Each structure stands twice: as structure tokens, then as C-alpha cells.
Design a protein around this nucleic acid. Sequence first.
DNA 1: CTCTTTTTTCTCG
DNA 2: GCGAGAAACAAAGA
Length: 266
Amino acid sequence: PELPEVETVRRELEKRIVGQKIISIEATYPRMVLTGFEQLKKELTGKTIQGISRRGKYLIFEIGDDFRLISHLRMEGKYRLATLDAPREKHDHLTMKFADGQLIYADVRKFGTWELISTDQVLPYFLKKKIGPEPTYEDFDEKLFREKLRKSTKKIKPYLLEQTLVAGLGNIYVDEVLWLAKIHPEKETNQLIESSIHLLHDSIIEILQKAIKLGGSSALGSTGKMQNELQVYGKTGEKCSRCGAEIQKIKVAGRGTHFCPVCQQK
DNA sequence: CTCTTTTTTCTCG
DNA sequence: GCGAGAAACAAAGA
Ligand SMILES: O=c1[nH]c(S)nc2[nH]cnc12
């Protein structure tokens, strides 16, 4: 999941589980609770979910006044709301049981994580990760963006994927953003001119906000419609609608990369 | 059979 | 520090 999918999930969870008391917490895979499963179980049980927030691709459960549960879904994490008599499925790892249902976390690849953090430790937590600003006109300052790009010789695609320039892009939407802004994914950032940087900046906010509005690209968060709007990602060999040009796939710093070479030259 | 594909952290050199 | 890319892991596919 990338930011739009994670934001979709956050909204669905906000509608359903906020206000509910955690009756118990059970795990078949406690290793994904990085801060310690017994501790999390002991602290959160009996507490009421007060809210759900998000920061980049991180979910933040506000549980009680003093605790935050930071969940990351990584590559394949999925939440679903189920009745209490629901059977366990093969890649279900964690369950948060309420009086009238349960929240189950599943993850085929077991990459996803849970971290129990104090409320006053949430900002330090994200500072330590050097998470960049949220992809909004209010938070995503073009000038800071411009300066970070000029001071770096990194390739633009892997630099955007680092979460430090701006939070929330993953492989899908970075490919889409660079196509939209007509920038080659291997372009060194200190080579970008001001006008490209401006378009890139606006593109990042436009693509992500549109994907959020369409419910993301597609068990919560599975009814998204952004996958019909994708111009390049996963469309290797198809047309760019540029006079017969086709989408190429390459590897960039180990990641599959879809782009239109005709439109995205260095 | 083998190897490659599909977020963040970590290791290498 | 760098930057690339394998590994945490599973499953599918070539
Ligand atoms: O069909 C098109 N062909 C080309 S070469 N460029 C375009 N820009 C928008 N549509 C087109």
C-alpha cells in the first residue's frame, strides 16, 4: 500500500472502530510487534480507540489518551473487520477483539509492523525517520523541495522513494508522477531546472490527492478505482498515447520502473 | 529443477 | 558518508 491506500484504510477504520473498547489482543505472529507483544497486550487491553491518524504510509491508532499504535502495512498488509466467530486464515497474524467484532491483520510476506509508542513520542518517532512533509499545498513547501534537490546527486526516483523529500510515494505513484512531470527516473536531482521542479511538486500533490479521492489502487481498502487511471505503472509494452510510443520497463536501484522514454529524457 | 517478480532497513565496499 | 540492491518473507511465474 502507498499513501492513498493507507489513507483509504484509515478512513474506513475511523468510521467503524473508533469508540470501541479493546476486549483482547491475540497473535499467531508476535514477532511483527516490534516493541514487544506482551507489553502491547498488557497496555492496550481495556482501552478505547479514540482515533486513527496517518503519517506518510504509517497508520497511527490513538488508543487511550497516552498510547499510539503505529502500524505499517509494508508490501502486502491488509486489515479486515470480521465477526467474532470468523475462522483464522493462513496469513492472519494479529487480531484485536472488540465486543461485537474483531480487527484482523494479515500479511502474506510478514513484513508489516506494529509499534506501541507514547503519545508524546510520536513526533520524535517520525523525526528519527526523517519523514518529509505530507503531499499537500499547505505542508509540502516547494522552496525546501527545490533546495534539497539541488544539493543532491541522487537519482530522482529513488530519492522520492526515501520518504524524506515528501511522504507517501511508493513504486506505483512515483512512476505516475515522473510521467506526469515528464522527468526521467534516473535524472540526477541537481540537474533539474526550476520549472521541472515546480511541475514535479504540483504533480506529486495532484496525483496523490486524486488517488485518495478514487479510493486508491486495487478486506478494507480493496474497493479503490485509481488503478483505472494509471498511465504507466505495470503497462509495459502499451501505448503512451504519444504517436506510437510504448511504455518501457527498466530497473532503477532494484525497483521495477515504468516510463515513456520519448517523454522522459534527461 | 532455477531464477525473477512484487516497503523499509541494513550491509557492502 | 555514498548508492545500489538484497533481505525480512511468500507466492507466483518464467
Ligand atoms: O496523439 C498524440 N501524439 C503525439 S506525438 N503527441 C500527443 N500529445 C497528445 N496527444 C498526442
